Design a protein around this nucleic acid. Structure first.
Ligand SMILES: Nc1ncnc2c1ncn2[C@H]1C[C@H](O)[C@@H](COP(=O)(O)OP(=O)(O)OP(=O)(O)O)O1
Ligand code: SF4
Ligand SMILES: [Mg+2]
Lengths: 187, 869
DNA sequence: ATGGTCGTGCCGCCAATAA
């Protein structure tokens, strides 16, 4: 279903800011750390991508990093296949829940994964939202919620005033759920 | 009466065939012939000894009931007399009570108690090892060997002069020796000490095989040997090393000798005999061995391939009197160093490869490498397949014979230069075991025999034979970087033996039942282990004192260094044997305690040195590196002396010395550093000598080109030049190396990589991913000379074009120029052999990085870092 | 058939739980 020519548009329109930042980092640096790689692979599996297209996209992006295909094949192809439950125990995996991304495995230096509303600094988040044509009132509300230790409802309000809807109508527990709810209204 | 002296050299026994007898071979003195000849003596009526531990209270074999009557010695005597003897058919025995001390791991045994010592001939059967009874709780020494019992009873420590009392003639000869003797009981043998050892006879030989083309089989076609008749074990090697020689050559089968070969032999006029078939050559060699009667046989790879092939050829050819190779008369030989040792009974076998491996560490242990290193000469290697081609010309056959003779001469020269025989004799005389077993290598046997002698001499009972695990050393956290000021290094002399002597660590003193036992009380007397290690420590100190003598020959200094290193290794192996699970004296707690004490000593020394406002940057379980941050040798020397005095004030037996003073040190990681060592010469002047420790350059699994580049980089870095010029020099050298590699002017011999084999090549399940095992498989399947465990394999990675991985594209060096589709893979060597070593070496210094190295080498930097545009 | 501690190069394997 999903092709390679609309993933960028989907990230800019439907993806939450965390995975949008991960996609931008993968596009620019042509590389990612283990946390970002795992999160992006699980999300791409969740949205509906199969093994062939995911492998094609990953190898094409790695070519943009300028390492030989053999290196990628013997280094990370096994990990990608195991992420889909196609090797080892052959156990299918669930994409990381929003609660785990917010709390579990916090990012470190050089890591772009995790919740920006909890990990990314507010001062850089201001220009990040400016790049996302976010209204100043929404930015102030998001900052106030962040100062109030509110992350799930903060992303809920973010989805609300980026989706031109007053009420989202769901409880935020999964970025895959976020994308599905965004697509249910957009499409 | 009648009595004759004797000098034994070897022993042999066979419980299964002739129980209760020991054969001794050696030299005897004859006045009429004014020379020493081989002799053998038989000792019989060797009887087993048993020790029965009486029980303080008898217990029934059903519920352990104690009636109330105390147990007397006569009760145990009656129990053995009327119960054990009848059941196991024991006819005659002698019994008497004695006193013994037991201090080993077996529990429920008092330290001092009486035992029932019963002796009977070995002909009667053997009691079970775990026998139990109404009045005795345990039995010791059920399965003691006859040879060991004889040696411990007569207190014989290695070769020595022996006196036989009341000799008896033999009705039927049993050995190929000139003189024979017989002793009824071992009580008639005595040892003397004030006689110098007699001269011996040394025989060196080697052969050249030939693989049959029609069927998979090997035959011997040429052979030569060298004999010396007055070799002395108490002096230097004689000059010349040999006095006589002989050689014999025979055709394999189908090929015939070139015409007029006998005329050429007569023209040359050398002691060479041409043999018709293989059987004639084998018979001639067997007769020659008996006629010469050698005492030491020295060769290369004798235990691995030579002896087995020779015995197999003798068997298949059915040569008469196969026993002439040994010194005993037998009919059927065994087959598997056990079968070979049994076959060569009576004659000492010395292998140059084993001795070289035990003494000197080299890149490889082939004959060519040994000649190149020890003798600094090159040896021409004749390809195995070309043997058939060179069999049609007289000149080629003569060249082959001369090459065999040269190989024998090289083996003899290497053996004489390494001084293996005097060192082995000294080690045997120290330990007290059989000297022929010493030449086979190994450290467990020597330590076991030494401890056995020590415990037997002190009236103890030794345990019967059989049928990571704890905290070790401590290494401090290094301070990675580059240092320019003078750096000290303090070392401990014989740390573990010193700790053992200081803290009286011994079996008798330490009470034990994963916990470290407490230290023994200082009021207790010295244990057996410290008193036995003190002799080795004193011997090493004496050797070092002899070293300190000035104006010595360069070869004598090297021989003394080898001797002292061997002595130090032997002394150190005593501690290691305490942690050997298969050892006869296995004791983990003692090793744990000594390691803990060493760690505590290191910590205390480090803390007390830090207390004096000095920087400590490294240390490995006995050392401390101090950054004095000075530039004059006098001040650092005075500070080192002060610290040495402060350290040595605390202890009584431990000592500390200034091992060396560095001028500049580059520390990379743990056990990996390189520095310049300052050595004074005269008039207060000093010279600097480079040295390496643990770097990737000193390893044998790297190509020589990478090693040379790393050595040059290390030499340039440690120099005193400005930091700006060294970067330019390294860049220029790397550019030149990159240009030369792609140009193809580099010799092929610089791309060889050497690796060792642990197991047999057929035992590797990952043969598809291991290159060295693949090359070993290829050379075994399609080649001649066979590679086994412990051998080294040389391989080169070449471009194959099959789109396979690097690990599956290994080939033998001889396979490269033979074919046409194989070429040197320059990319692999320039990107995975040179770059990693240089990048790791130059990591601590600034101005050099992986990207810069890649650019200088001419590679593609678009893989290492890039990414950021 | 001595003990332990340390690093370098090849491979395969795993996490996950909405709707
Ligand atoms: N090959 C070995 N086998 C067993 N233990 C060893 C071995 N090498 C070293 N050790 C142990 C015991 C030593 O006391 C300790 C330190 O050894 P090392 O520094 O080489 O020499 P050493 O402290 O015994 O004195 P020396 O400097 O006089 O040779 O490490
Ligand atoms: S709340 Fe969840 S979906 Fe929203 S930015 Fe944070 S991690 Fe992403
Ligand atoms: Mg990786």
């Amino acid at each position: 279903k999903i092709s390679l020519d609309q993933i960028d548009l989907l990230s800019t329109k439907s993806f939450p800011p965390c995975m949008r930042q991960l996609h931008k980092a993968l596009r620019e640096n042509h590389h990612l750390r283990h946390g970002g790689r795992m999160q992006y692979g699980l999300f791409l599996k969740g949205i509906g991508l199969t093994l062939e297209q995911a492998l094609q996209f990953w190898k094409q992006e790695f070519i943009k990093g300028k390492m030989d295909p053999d290196k990628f094949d013997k280094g990370y192809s096994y990990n990608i296949r195991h992420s889909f439950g196609k090797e080892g125990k052959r156990t299918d995996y669930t994409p990381f829940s929003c609660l785990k991304i917010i709390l579990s495995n916090p990012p470190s230096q050089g890591d772009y994964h995790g919740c920006p509303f909890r990990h990314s600094d507010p001062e850089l988040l201001k220009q990040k939202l400016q790049s996302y044509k976010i209204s100043p009132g929404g930015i102030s509300q998001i900052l106030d919620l962040v100062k109030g230790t509110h992350y799930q409802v903060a992303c809920q309000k973010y989805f609300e005033m980026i989706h031109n809807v007053d009420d989202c109508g769901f409880s935020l527990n999964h970025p895959n759920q976020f994308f599905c709810e965004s697509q249910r209204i957009l499409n | 009466e009648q009595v004759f002296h004797f000098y034994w050299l070897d022993a042999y026994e066979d419980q299964y065939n002739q129980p209760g007898v020991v054969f001794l071979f050696g030299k005897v003195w004859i006045e009429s012939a004014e020379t020493h000849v081989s002799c053998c003596v038989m000792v019989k009526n060797i009887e087993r000894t048993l020790y029965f531990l009486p029980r303080e209270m008898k217990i029934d074999l059903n519920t352990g009931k104690e009636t109330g009557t105390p147990i007397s010695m006569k009760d145990v005597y009656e129990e053995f007399d009327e119960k054990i003897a009848t059941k196991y058919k024991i006819m005659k025995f002698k019994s008497k009570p004695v006193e013994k001390n037991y201090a080993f791991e077996i529990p429920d045994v008092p330290e001092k108690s009486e035992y029932l010592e019963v002796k009977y001939s070995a002909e009667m059967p053997q009691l079970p090892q775990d026998l139990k009874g109404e009045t005795f709780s345990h039995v010791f020494g059920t399965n003691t060997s006859s040879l060991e019992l004889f040696l411990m009873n007569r207190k014989i420590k290695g070769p020595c002069w022996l006196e036989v009392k009341s000799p008896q003639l033999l009705n039927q000869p049993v050995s190929w020796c000139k003189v024979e003797a017989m002793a009824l009981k071992p009580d008639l043998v005595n040892v003397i000490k004030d006689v110098s050892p007699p001269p011996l006879v040394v025989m060196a030989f080697s052969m050249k095989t030939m693989q049959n083309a029609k069927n998979h089989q090997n035959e011997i076609i040429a052979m030569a040997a060298l004999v010396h008749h007055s070799f002395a074990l108490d002096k230097a090697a004689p000059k010349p090393p040999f006095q006589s020689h002989f050689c014999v050559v025979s055709k394999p089968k189908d090929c015939i000798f070139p015409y007029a070969f006998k005329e050429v032999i007569e023209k040359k006029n050398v002691k060479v005999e041409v043999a018709a078939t293989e059987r004639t050559l084998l018979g001639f060699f067997l007769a020659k061995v008996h006629k010469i009667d050698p005492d030491i046989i020295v060769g290369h790879n004798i235990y691995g391939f030579e002896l087995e092939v020779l015995l197999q050829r003798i068997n298949v050819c059915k040569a008469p009197h196969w026993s002439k190779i040994g010194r005993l008369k037998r009919s059927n030989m065994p087959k598997l160093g056990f079968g070979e040792r049994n076959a060569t009974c009576g004659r000492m076998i010395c292998d140059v490869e084993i001795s070289a491996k035990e003494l000197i560490r080299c890149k490889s242990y082939h004959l060519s490498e040994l000649v190149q290193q020890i003798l600094k000469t090159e040896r021409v290697v004749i390809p195995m397949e070309n043997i058939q081609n060179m069999y049609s010309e007289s000149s080629q056959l003569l060249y082959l014979l001369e090459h065999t003779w040269k190989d024998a001469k090289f083996i003899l020269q290497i053996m004489c230069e390494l001084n293996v025989l005097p060192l082995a004799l000294q080690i045997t005389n120290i330990a007290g075991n059989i000297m022929s077993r010493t030449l086979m290598g190994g450290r467990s046997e020597r330590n076991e025999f030494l401890l056995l002698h020590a415990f037997y001499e002190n009236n103890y009972i030794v345990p019967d034979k059989q049928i990571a695990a704890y905290a070790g050393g401590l290494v401090l956290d290094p301070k990675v970087g580059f240092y320019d000021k003078f750096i000290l290094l303090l070392d401990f002399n014989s740390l573990y033996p010193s700790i053992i002597q200081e803290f009286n660590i011994c079996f008798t003193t330490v009470q034990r039942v994963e916990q470290i036992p407490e230290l023994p009380d200082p009021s207790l007397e010295m244990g057996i282990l410290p008193r036995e290690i003190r002799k080795l420590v004193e011997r090493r100190k004496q050797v070092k004192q002899l070293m300190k003598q000035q104006d010595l020959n360069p070869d004598l200094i090297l021989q003394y260094d080898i001797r002292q290193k061997a002595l130090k290794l032997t002394a150190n192996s005593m501690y290691g044997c305490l942690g050997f699970s298969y050892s006869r004296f296995y004791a983990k707690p003692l090793a744990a305690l000594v390691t803990y004490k060493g760690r505590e000593i290191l910590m205390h020394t480090k803390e007390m040195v830090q207390k004096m406002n000095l920087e400590v940057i490294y240390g490995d379980t006995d050392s401390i590196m101090i950054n004095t941050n000075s530039t004059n040798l006098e001040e650092v020397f005075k500070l080192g002396n002060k610290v040495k005095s402060e350290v040595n004030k605390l202890y009584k037996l431990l000592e500390i010395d200034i091992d060396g003073v560095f001028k500049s040190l580059l520390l990379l990681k743990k056990k990996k550093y390189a520095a310049l060592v300052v050595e004074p010469t005269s008039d207060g002047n000093y010279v600097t000598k480079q040295e390496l420790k643990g770097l990737d350059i000193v390893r044998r699994d790297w190509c020589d080109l990478a090693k040379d580049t790393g050595n040059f980089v290390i030499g340039q870095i440690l120099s005193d030049q400005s930091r700006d010029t060294i970067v330019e020099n390294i860049q220029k050298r790397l550019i030149e190396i990159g240009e030369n590699v792609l140009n193809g002017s580099v010799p092929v011999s610089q791309f060889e990589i050497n690796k060792a084999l642990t197991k047999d090549p057929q035992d590797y399940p990952d043969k598809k991913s291991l290159p060295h095992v693949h090359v070993a498989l290829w050379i075994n399947s399609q080649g001649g000379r066979k590679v086994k465990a412990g051998d080294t394999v040389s391989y080169v990675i070449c471009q194959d074009g099959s789109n396979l991985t690097a690990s599956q594209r290994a080939y033998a060096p001889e396979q490269l120029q033979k074919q046409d589709n194989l070429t040197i893979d320059t990319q692999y060597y320039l990107a995975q052999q040179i770059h990693p070593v240089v990048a790791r070496i130059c990591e601590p210094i600034d101005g050099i990085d992986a990207v810069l190295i890649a650019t200088w080498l001419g590679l593609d930097p678009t893989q290492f870092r890039v990414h950021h545009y």
